[PDB]
Symmetry: D2
Subunit: 183 residues, 4 copies
């Protein structure tokens, strides 16, 4: 029975079981465009609630990745239709950090947004009533935010990692600080 929840992108350029060094059925999996945890998405949140409360999964992983079309279409003007609405949550993140990204060479922005987005989604995840509740009642649970680089097939931990609400705040804020200030 599964011990992990993988929240990944529908691009699914990796096999989650390879990257996690797991076999299938250990992994409970949700996937959407640009691996989002939206506060009021019933679909993702159901997944999380069932995993956390019913299955007692101890580890949730948001894995983002490079050369993601959601990330690219988020940065692009183009009216693509309904998917724009879903990607507007990422555009909001794009402008939230517009100073960092402006300072950036246009060609390194997608890589950077991919990262920022993973951090932000782990932050959304750790603020859900589900996860906070699990923590308050002593349930063991850890959130993780990874990025797969499609161009060299490597994972990178993004230093975003929470086992409580205080630890969420500490590593989120520190992650954004590095991303914002470091070269």
């Amino acid at each position: 029975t599964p011990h992990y929840l993988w929240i990944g992108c529908s691009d699914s350029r990796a096999p989650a079981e390879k990257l996690t060094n797991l076999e299938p059925g250990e992994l409970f999996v949700h996937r959407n465009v640009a691996n989002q945890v939206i506060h009021t998405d019933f679909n993702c949140l159901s997944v999380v609630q069932y995993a956390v409360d019913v299955l007692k999964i101890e580890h949730i992983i948001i894995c983002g990745h490079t050369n993601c079309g959601g990330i690219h279409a988020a940065m692009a003007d183009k009216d693509l239709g309904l998917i724009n609405n879903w990607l507007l949550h990422i555009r909001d993140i794009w402008f939230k950090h517009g100073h960092l990204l402006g300072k950036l060479s246009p060609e390194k922005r997608a890589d950077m947004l991919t990262k920022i987005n993973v951090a932000e989604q782990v932050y959304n995840l750790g603020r859900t009533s589900i996860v906070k509740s699990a923590w308050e009642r002593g349930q063991k649970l850890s959130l993780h935010g990874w990025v797969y680089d499609v161009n060299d097939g490597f994972l990178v931990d993004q230093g975003v990692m929470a086992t409580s609400r205080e630890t969420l705040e500490i590593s989120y804020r520190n992650a954004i600080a590095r991303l914002s200030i470091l070269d």
Copy 2:
């Protein structure tokens, strides 16, 4: 650049790339509990829309599976919280085929509901505005609904396939009539 969209279940052992002879790269994947296509689900409908309108994917496959925790949780009268609201859609489906399902041995009922489900999710998929308009404007698009078993593999009753709204009805209705023959 991907050529297929796979709608699967969050439980299912066996990811799309293992079940298929397709790499990761050619598969665009959505997964949720009990592999649903709910009419008003922004999450899944955004995957479908992006797949069809933008990536120009020409085949969508809804894959259900036997021994599925969603299907089983749908059937139980358990207060599991938020997830029950998601699964109420599967319980509507159960109630809609209650007569058929009531006829079966209780041990055969989960396998039936799993197959009925794929059939209903392909019927929902195929009535979305996104898919009808694709067809309306002449874009090639095939919907498929399959059920996977760990032991037997893919059940050679297959089921649903649609290349239009008209083939959608025929295929849906026959699949239900066929599953009713016991």
Copy 3:
């Protein structure tokens, strides 16, 4: 502070406070196209959860009405765009009861669907984990399903009324039975 939740149509052809013989602020109000309670609509369900669990509202009213455009567009072919997706829940209800409605004169079908829909939405409402939970813990709560006739300005109770899950089943099933079998 409010003692009722009104779930009504965005057509809002009535003033809810007139119909309920209430003043504003007694009424907590949600409105959408064709007064739906969809199982996985986060928007409506939030409204209900906040009303039931935080505000301790004792009465939820789903009020439907005649000459509703949601009901009409549900019955119509026409691809209107995104609203079709929302109205597909009503089309499903339209075909669920296609034998009743077929037996009907084409001009009385909209009136009938309006009614069926109110009954079905009270049924969805009473199956939500929120409302069922409220009941299991002894909370006092009653669901009601009304229809306003715009052409003569009258309410009609639809005999759909639940104060538990057993009473939900009894009046729902009886409501459909009358609608199905009676002239």
Copy 4:
């Protein structure tokens, strides 16, 4: 046949028809907690789309209100359940204007957040695909964001108005810059 769409809050005393000189009949109304237009909310976006594309409504008004239970529940650290997830969107907004709000006397903070909110919901409304395409294709459409008070009535700082994506930026940004002047 309606001519206006009103997006209001489920709390607010005073329905649209009382606040306005419009009958019921001319108003199409959506109400949710803290009068939100969330990018991915099928419920509200279906009202907007039907209003704009089908009913051809030419004015949308988001009306917020002072002494609003959503705004207040957003600010509290209370575990109220599902509703907190809905309100996390308001808390993002709080965090986004934290510096401004941190400057104010705590007793003035709820009124500010209420006004900031309407400004952000009009900004979301105006970036939906439905509204941009309406404008793109030349259809006349005006977005308005007002805040109501039980005592003072409508606050004559008004705020946002958009008849295009360009007027949307100007109006949004100025409204925020203006509310920052203390």
